[PDB]
């Protein structure tokens, strides 16, 4: 026990040293130097599409790089690919397991990924010579439910799971290439950088970590929130990111300052966050809530600029097009809507 | 003119053919009932599902599945055994099930409080409201001999047992001992007390006594699903 106590003392000393190092750099606060800029409080928008046809509640959706086609997942056991402009259905894939909770769309548009409560990630080929969508690969090795996945290219993909780990895969061989093993609680969100050199994740231990894809190691950790984290997103320029939690607050972190520098909250909000996203320029921050309403935040002044209403059950997913022309949201009422 | 042709191909071929299959699948989805099975490792829930499968899919990876049919109605039952210790996130995937099956080892006095706490937590969760529960007290045969042996007492775990008295609604079996009935109904009332306290009119619980060698368990679930669906249909037509 003496050695364990000694190691605990060393950990405490290093924690104190890091906290002291952080405080030295806090010369100014963002709210005190962005005080003189203009507000953007005129934001108001209306829904003008409604995609209908899912039988059960929706968990995940993702935009294509052309910003016209998108995919969605529902726990009735279907993946539907939609055409946003005409609202026509172009594909419908029945899944082996009904308890899906994530999906992704390849940047090249040739493949889609899927997975969930069966601890497996499945890859589907959308352009085979026969003209029929068919399963092409299954990835196994996680010991917990799959929670998120994002393509790097046609041949490799990154994933996070409830077993407290993340992995990098080679689709051709089907083998894990790297494993990330720092978090203490369940991991259920990840975000790729614009250059795909590094990525960030958040877990149930109320902390986030920065990972190096090639070196396979962590070099930063953030501890602002005070409860479970379930959403995360990068800033457009890649120097910051935003986080959402069930303590009913959002926070912004800076990679280079290594510190928290903004919080978004209001007294009359008690529900938790479920989604986060940024507009094309980064001035606006959009987030979904368990009150099935969505608030638009002035990310640079910290005020609310608007609200999106029209769903009648928990808002589950949220996404912005690659060119910033529209925003799509899903909900547990089994409908999906496009705004502005 | 090619734009018109592409629009025609899309709207005619893809959308209508997809919608036809979706309409076909909707009936099959609506005609089936899906259930969630919960319990500790010492309970005999696996014995229950195997026994009622013998009365009449397979494999397991993250989840285990079971099929059974009674009066030409299909039931699907799921057992989430591939996950680790914490429940609070994957539990809310089942907000849409018709009912939850809860199994308890009645003969284990030491572990009864843990099951009671789990039942309370499940009952009072935000996303698990409005869902009824079927409660099974599983090991009456062991409880009978444990009580009649007298070596281990109940009041050392539940001191309120000394003041308990059997209710007038008790229906003992013909050969049962009165004190076995007393302990058995006390254990049942422990769960019913939590159930009736915060339970609103939209939420009900159905207790049962069962044993390892038992064959009516399939029909009981059918009879309880009957009652809750009947209440739902009464509610929609403003009759409740």
């Amino acid at each position, epitope marked *: 026990q003496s050695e364990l106590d000694q190691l605990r003392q060393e950990a405490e000393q290093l924690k104190n040293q890091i906290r002291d190092a952080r405080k030295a750099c806090a010369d100014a606060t963002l709210s005190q130097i962005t005080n003189n800029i203009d507000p953007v409080g005129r934001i108001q928008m209306r829904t003008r599409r409604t995609l209908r046809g899912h039988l059960a509640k929706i968990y995940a959706m993702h935009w294509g790089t052309d910003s016209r086609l998108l995919v969605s997942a529902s726990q009735d056991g279907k993946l539907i690919i939609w055409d946003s402009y005409t609202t026509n259905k172009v594909h419908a894939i029945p899944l082996r397991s009904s308890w899906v909770m994530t999906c992704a769309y390849a940047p090249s548009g040739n493949y889609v990924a899927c997975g969930g409560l069966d601890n497996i990630c499945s890859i589907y080929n959308l352009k085979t010579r026969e003209g029929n969508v068919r399963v092409s690969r299954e990835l196994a090795g996680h010991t917990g439910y799959l929670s998120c996945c994002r393509f790097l290219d046609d041949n490799q993909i990154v994933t996070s799971s409830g077993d407290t780990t993340c992995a990098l895969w080679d689709i051709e061989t089907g083998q894990q290439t790297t494993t990330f093993t720092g978090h*203490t609680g369940d991991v259920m969100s990840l975000s790729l950088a614009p250059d795909t050199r590094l990525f960030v994740s958040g877990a149930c231990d109320a902390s986030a970590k920065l990972w190096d894809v090639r070196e396979g190691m962590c070099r930063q950790t953030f501890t602002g929130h005070e*409860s479970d984290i379930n959403a995360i997103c990068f800033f457009p320029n890649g120097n910051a990111f935003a986080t959402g939690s069930d303590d009913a607050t959002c926070r912004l972190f800076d990679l280079r300052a290594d510190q928290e520098l903004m919080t978004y909250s209001h007294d009359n909000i008690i529900c938790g966050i479920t989604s986060v996203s940024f507009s094309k320029s980064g001035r606006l921050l959009l987030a979904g809530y368990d009150d099935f309403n969505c608030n638009v935040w002035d990310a640079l002044k910290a005020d609310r600029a608007g609200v999106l209403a029209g769903h009648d059950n928990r808002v589950s997913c949220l996404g912005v097009t690659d060119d910033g022309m529209a925003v799509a949201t899903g909900s547990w009422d089994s409908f999906l809507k496009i705004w502005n | 003119t090619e734009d018109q042709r592409n629009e025609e191909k899309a709207q005619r071929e893809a959308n209508k053919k997809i919608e036809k299959q979706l309409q076909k699948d909707k009936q099959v989805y609506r005609a089936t009932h899906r259930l969630l099975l919960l319990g500790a490792d010492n309970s005999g829930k696996s014995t229950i599902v195997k026994q009622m499968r013998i009365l009449h899919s397979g494999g397991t990876s993250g989840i285990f599945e079971t099929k059974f049919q009674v009066d030409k109605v299909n039931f699907h039952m799921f057992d989430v055994g591939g996950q680790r210790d914490e429940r609070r996130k994957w539990i809310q995937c089942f907000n849409d099930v018709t009912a939850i099956i809860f199994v308890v080892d009645s003969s284990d006095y030491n572990r009864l409080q843990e099951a009671l706490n789990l039942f309370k937590s499940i009952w009072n969760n*935000r996303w698990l409201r409005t869902i009824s529960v079927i409660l099974f007290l599983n090991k009456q045969d062991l409880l009978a001999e444990k009580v009649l042996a007298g070596k281990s007492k109940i009041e*050392d775990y539940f001191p309120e047992f000394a003041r308990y008295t059997t209710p007038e609604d008790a229906t003992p079996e013909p050969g049962e001992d009165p004190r076995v009935t007393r302990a058995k109904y006390f254990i049942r009332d422990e769960f019913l007390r939590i159930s009736t306290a915060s339970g609103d009119g939209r939420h009900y619980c159905y207790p049962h006594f069962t044993c390892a060698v038992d064959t009516e368990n399939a029909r009981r679930i059918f009879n309880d699903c009957r009652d809750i669906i009947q209440r739902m249909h009464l509610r929609q037509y403003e009759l409740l």
Partner: nanobody
Amino acid sequence: QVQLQESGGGLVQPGGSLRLSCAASGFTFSNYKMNWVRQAPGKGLEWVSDISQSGASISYTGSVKGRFTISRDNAKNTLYLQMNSLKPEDTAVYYCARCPAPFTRDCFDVTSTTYAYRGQGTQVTVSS
């Protein structure tokens, strides 16, 4: 940084008295519910007691009713446990835990292994 630090404990004779203290920081203490949990030698974690946000609706396990008492002090962010007439089987390590959400009645995973929002623990021994 959420952290909990227990205090008190030590050795006591059978029939003796003792009390524990728990200090919390890094979150709004007045919003959450609090718990006491212990682990005896060669056994898993076990339920003891809890207390709500305002200090009403207290509950105990049947093994310690009439002997143990729980209380809060919201103005100081501290939690107490008063123990009287201790018995030999009370020897265990006692932890300070809080339920995961700020306004709910749910306390699913407080007794789970490797739970996040729990302290390090203190040793209590009863012997002749």
